[PDB]
Amino acid sequence: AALAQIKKEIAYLLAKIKAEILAALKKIKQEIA
Amino acid sequence: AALAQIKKEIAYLLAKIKAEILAALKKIKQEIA
Amino acid sequence: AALAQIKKEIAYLLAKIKAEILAALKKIKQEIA
Amino acid sequence: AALAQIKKEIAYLLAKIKAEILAALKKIKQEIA
Incomplete structure:
Protein backbone atom coordinates (compact mmCIF):
# COMPACT_ATOMS: atom_id res chain seq x y z
CA ALA A 1 0.00 0.00 0.00
CA ALA A 2 2.67 2.60 0.95
CA LEU A 3 4.33 2.14 -2.47
CA ALA A 4 1.07 2.84 -4.29
CA GLN A 5 0.53 5.81 -1.96
CA ILE A 6 3.94 7.23 -2.93
CA LYS A 7 3.15 6.73 -6.62
CA LYS A 8 -0.24 8.46 -6.33
CA GLU A 9 1.26 11.44 -4.47
CA ILE A 10 4.15 11.93 -6.99
CA ALA A 11 1.59 11.61 -9.83
CA TYR A 12 -0.43 14.37 -8.24
CA LEU A 13 2.63 16.60 -7.89
CA LEU A 14 3.57 16.06 -11.54
CA ALA A 15 0.07 17.09 -12.66
CA LYS A 16 0.31 20.18 -10.43
CA ILE A 17 3.71 21.14 -11.95
CA LYS A 18 2.36 20.66 -15.47
CA LYS A 29 0.46 33.49 -25.38
CA GLN A 30 -2.31 35.77 -24.04
CA GLU A 31 0.11 38.74 -23.74
CA ILE A 32 1.24 38.39 -27.35
CA ALA A 33 -2.13 37.53 -29.03
CA ALA B 1 8.42 -6.16 -9.39
CA ALA B 2 6.05 -3.55 -7.89
CA LEU B 3 8.99 -1.12 -7.46
CA ALA B 4 9.94 -1.44 -11.13
CA GLN B 5 6.25 -1.04 -12.01
CA ILE B 6 6.10 2.24 -10.04
CA LYS B 7 9.27 3.46 -11.77
CA LYS B 8 7.93 2.62 -15.25
CA GLU B 9 4.61 4.37 -14.57
CA ILE B 10 6.25 7.59 -13.20
CA ALA B 11 8.65 7.53 -16.20
CA TYR B 12 5.65 7.40 -18.50
CA LEU B 13 3.97 10.31 -16.72
CA LEU B 14 7.15 12.41 -16.95
CA ALA B 15 7.34 11.81 -20.71
CA LYS B 16 3.66 12.77 -21.02
CA ILE B 17 4.23 16.03 -19.07
CA LYS B 18 7.25 16.87 -21.22
CA LYS B 29 6.75 29.54 -31.50
CA GLN B 30 4.24 28.82 -34.32
CA GLU B 31 2.14 31.90 -33.40
CA ILE B 32 5.16 34.21 -33.53
CA ALA B 33 6.98 32.74 -36.60
CA ALA C 1 11.20 5.51 6.43
CA ALA C 2 13.40 5.12 3.31
CA LEU C 3 10.28 5.17 1.09
CA ALA C 4 9.10 8.46 2.61
CA GLN C 5 12.66 9.77 2.24
CA ILE C 6 12.62 8.94 -1.49
CA LYS C 7 9.23 10.63 -1.87
CA LYS C 8 10.39 13.79 -0.09
CA GLU C 9 13.56 14.03 -2.20
CA ILE C 10 11.71 13.55 -5.55
CA ALA C 11 9.13 16.13 -4.38
CA TYR C 12 11.94 18.56 -3.75
CA LEU C 13 13.45 17.93 -7.19
CA LEU C 14 10.07 18.49 -8.87
CA ALA C 15 9.67 21.84 -7.11
CA LYS C 16 13.21 22.79 -8.19
CA ILE C 17 12.45 21.89 -11.84
CA LYS C 18 9.22 23.88 -11.75
CA LYS C 29 7.72 37.55 -20.54
CA GLN C 30 10.07 40.25 -19.17
CA GLU C 31 11.92 40.53 -22.52
CA ILE C 32 8.69 41.06 -24.44
CA ALA C 33 6.80 43.33 -21.95
CA ALA D 1 19.62 -0.65 -2.96
CA ALA D 2 16.79 -1.02 -5.53
CA LEU D 3 14.93 1.91 -3.90
CA ALA D 4 17.97 4.17 -4.23
CA GLN D 5 18.38 2.93 -7.81
CA ILE D 6 14.78 3.94 -8.61
CA LYS D 7 15.35 7.36 -7.03
CA LYS D 8 18.56 7.95 -9.00
CA GLU D 9 16.91 6.96 -12.30
CA ILE D 10 13.82 9.20 -11.77
CA ALA D 11 16.18 12.05 -10.75
CA TYR D 12 18.03 11.60 -14.01
CA LEU D 13 14.80 11.64 -16.01
CA LEU D 14 13.65 14.84 -14.28
CA ALA D 15 16.94 16.56 -15.16
CA LYS D 16 16.55 15.38 -18.77
CA ILE D 17 12.98 16.77 -18.96
CA LYS D 18 14.11 20.09 -17.49
CA LYS D 29 14.01 33.59 -26.66
CA GLN D 30 16.62 33.30 -29.45
CA GLU D 31 13.95 33.68 -32.18
CA ILE D 32 12.60 36.88 -30.63
CA ALA D 33 15.91 38.54 -29.53
Whole structure:
Protein backbone atom coordinates (compact mmCIF):
# COMPACT_ATOMS: atom_id res chain seq x y z
CA ALA A 1 0.00 0.00 0.00
CA ALA A 2 2.67 2.60 0.95
CA LEU A 3 4.33 2.14 -2.47
CA ALA A 4 1.07 2.84 -4.29
CA GLN A 5 0.53 5.81 -1.96
CA ILE A 6 3.94 7.23 -2.93
CA LYS A 7 3.15 6.73 -6.62
CA LYS A 8 -0.24 8.46 -6.33
CA GLU A 9 1.26 11.44 -4.47
CA ILE A 10 4.15 11.93 -6.99
CA ALA A 11 1.59 11.61 -9.83
CA TYR A 12 -0.43 14.37 -8.24
CA LEU A 13 2.63 16.60 -7.89
CA LEU A 14 3.57 16.06 -11.54
CA ALA A 15 0.07 17.09 -12.66
CA LYS A 16 0.31 20.18 -10.43
CA ILE A 17 3.71 21.14 -11.95
CA LYS A 18 2.36 20.66 -15.47
CA ALA A 19 -0.82 22.73 -14.86
CA GLU A 20 1.23 25.56 -13.32
CA ILE A 21 3.70 25.67 -16.20
CA LEU A 22 0.91 25.65 -18.80
CA ALA A 23 -0.79 28.43 -16.80
CA ALA A 24 2.29 30.69 -17.16
CA LEU A 25 2.67 29.75 -20.86
CA LYS A 26 -0.92 30.76 -21.55
CA LYS A 27 -0.32 34.10 -19.79
CA ILE A 28 2.54 34.58 -22.30
CA LYS A 29 0.46 33.49 -25.38
CA GLN A 30 -2.31 35.77 -24.04
CA GLU A 31 0.11 38.74 -23.74
CA ILE A 32 1.24 38.39 -27.35
CA ALA A 33 -2.13 37.53 -29.03
CA ALA B 1 8.42 -6.16 -9.39
CA ALA B 2 6.05 -3.55 -7.89
CA LEU B 3 8.99 -1.12 -7.46
CA ALA B 4 9.94 -1.44 -11.13
CA GLN B 5 6.25 -1.04 -12.01
CA ILE B 6 6.10 2.24 -10.04
CA LYS B 7 9.27 3.46 -11.77
CA LYS B 8 7.93 2.62 -15.25
CA GLU B 9 4.61 4.37 -14.57
CA ILE B 10 6.25 7.59 -13.20
CA ALA B 11 8.65 7.53 -16.20
CA TYR B 12 5.65 7.40 -18.50
CA LEU B 13 3.97 10.31 -16.72
CA LEU B 14 7.15 12.41 -16.95
CA ALA B 15 7.34 11.81 -20.71
CA LYS B 16 3.66 12.77 -21.02
CA ILE B 17 4.23 16.03 -19.07
CA LYS B 18 7.25 16.87 -21.22
CA ALA B 19 5.45 16.19 -24.54
CA GLU B 20 2.47 18.32 -23.45
CA ILE B 21 4.64 21.26 -22.39
CA LEU B 22 6.64 21.14 -25.63
CA ALA B 23 3.33 20.97 -27.52
CA ALA B 24 2.19 24.29 -25.99
CA LEU B 25 5.64 25.86 -26.54
CA LYS B 26 5.52 24.96 -30.23
CA LYS B 27 2.04 26.52 -30.49
CA ILE B 28 3.68 29.71 -29.14
CA LYS B 29 6.75 29.54 -31.50
CA GLN B 30 4.24 28.82 -34.32
CA GLU B 31 2.14 31.90 -33.40
CA ILE B 32 5.16 34.21 -33.53
CA ALA B 33 6.98 32.74 -36.60
CA ALA C 1 11.20 5.51 6.43
CA ALA C 2 13.40 5.12 3.31
CA LEU C 3 10.28 5.17 1.09
CA ALA C 4 9.10 8.46 2.61
CA GLN C 5 12.66 9.77 2.24
CA ILE C 6 12.62 8.94 -1.49
CA LYS C 7 9.23 10.63 -1.87
CA LYS C 8 10.39 13.79 -0.09
CA GLU C 9 13.56 14.03 -2.20
CA ILE C 10 11.71 13.55 -5.55
CA ALA C 11 9.13 16.13 -4.38
CA TYR C 12 11.94 18.56 -3.75
CA LEU C 13 13.45 17.93 -7.19
CA LEU C 14 10.07 18.49 -8.87
CA ALA C 15 9.67 21.84 -7.11
CA LYS C 16 13.21 22.79 -8.19
CA ILE C 17 12.45 21.89 -11.84
CA LYS C 18 9.22 23.88 -11.75
CA ALA C 19 10.83 27.00 -10.19
CA GLU C 20 13.66 26.91 -12.76
CA ILE C 21 11.29 26.60 -15.72
CA LEU C 22 9.08 29.43 -14.44
CA ALA C 23 12.25 31.50 -13.93
CA ALA C 24 13.16 31.17 -17.64
CA LEU C 25 9.54 31.83 -18.70
CA LYS C 26 9.48 35.06 -16.70
CA LYS C 27 12.76 36.14 -18.35
CA ILE C 28 10.91 35.67 -21.67
CA LYS C 29 7.72 37.55 -20.54
CA GLN C 30 10.07 40.25 -19.17
CA GLU C 31 11.92 40.53 -22.52
CA ILE C 32 8.69 41.06 -24.44
CA ALA C 33 6.80 43.33 -21.95
CA ALA D 1 19.62 -0.65 -2.96
CA ALA D 2 16.79 -1.02 -5.53
CA LEU D 3 14.93 1.91 -3.90
CA ALA D 4 17.97 4.17 -4.23
CA GLN D 5 18.38 2.93 -7.81
CA ILE D 6 14.78 3.94 -8.61
CA LYS D 7 15.35 7.36 -7.03
CA LYS D 8 18.56 7.95 -9.00
CA GLU D 9 16.91 6.96 -12.30
CA ILE D 10 13.82 9.20 -11.77
CA ALA D 11 16.18 12.05 -10.75
CA TYR D 12 18.03 11.60 -14.01
CA LEU D 13 14.80 11.64 -16.01
CA LEU D 14 13.65 14.84 -14.28
CA ALA D 15 16.94 16.56 -15.16
CA LYS D 16 16.55 15.38 -18.77
CA ILE D 17 12.98 16.77 -18.96
CA LYS D 18 14.11 20.09 -17.49
CA ALA D 19 17.10 20.46 -19.87
CA GLU D 20 14.90 19.67 -22.89
CA ILE D 21 12.22 22.18 -21.91
CA LEU D 22 14.81 24.91 -21.28
CA ALA D 23 16.36 24.04 -24.66
CA ALA D 24 13.06 24.77 -26.46
CA LEU D 25 12.51 27.94 -24.38
CA LYS D 26 15.92 29.27 -25.38
CA LYS D 27 15.12 28.57 -29.05
CA ILE D 28 12.06 30.80 -28.51
CA LYS D 29 14.01 33.59 -26.66
CA GLN D 30 16.62 33.30 -29.45
CA GLU D 31 13.95 33.68 -32.18
CA ILE D 32 12.60 36.88 -30.63
CA ALA D 33 15.91 38.54 -29.53
